[PDB]
């Protein structure tokens, strides 16, 4: 429902950045960097949900989803 209070603690909004390599072909995999965006304490053992990586032209060039590795 539109009018409701959700107060989550296990979810963080993040920005994912990656490099599109030369001569990249569909189906190949690349590394991504996940950075928190607002008042999140940690991203220790989180899992990145399906994220479309846009280019400068605002077109989806990659789809990101995986487990984050934080140093510790």
């Amino acid at each position: 429902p539109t009018g409701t209070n959700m107060q989550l603690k296990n979810v963080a909004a993040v920005m994912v950045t990656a490099s599109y390599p030369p001569f990249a072909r569909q189906g190949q995999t690349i590394d991504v960097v996940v950075s928190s965006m607002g008042n999140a304490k940690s991203l220790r053992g989180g899992t990145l949900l399906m994220t479309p990586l846009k280019g400068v032209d605002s077109q989806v060039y990659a789809l990101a989803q995986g487990n984050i590795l934080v140093g510790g």
Partner: protein
């Protein structure tokens, strides 16, 4: 494809066909006024109610 779109720059119209919101707020009020006046009043009187005899010729 839509071409380079910035990420932190505000959404402004850049090309032909882009839309922009105008908040029409006009309030013009001009005025002028002027006046002029003049007046002039005069009275004169001289009455020899009782003329002395040495002055009755004048």
């Amino acid at each position: 494809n839509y071409g380079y779109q910035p990420l932190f720059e505000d959404r402004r119209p850049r090309n032909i066909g882009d839309t922009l919101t105008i908040v029409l707020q006009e309030n013009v009020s001009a005025s002028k006024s002027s006046s002029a006046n003049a007046s002039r009043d005069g009275k004169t009187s001289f009455g020899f109610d009782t003329v002395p005899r040495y002055l009755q010729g004048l």
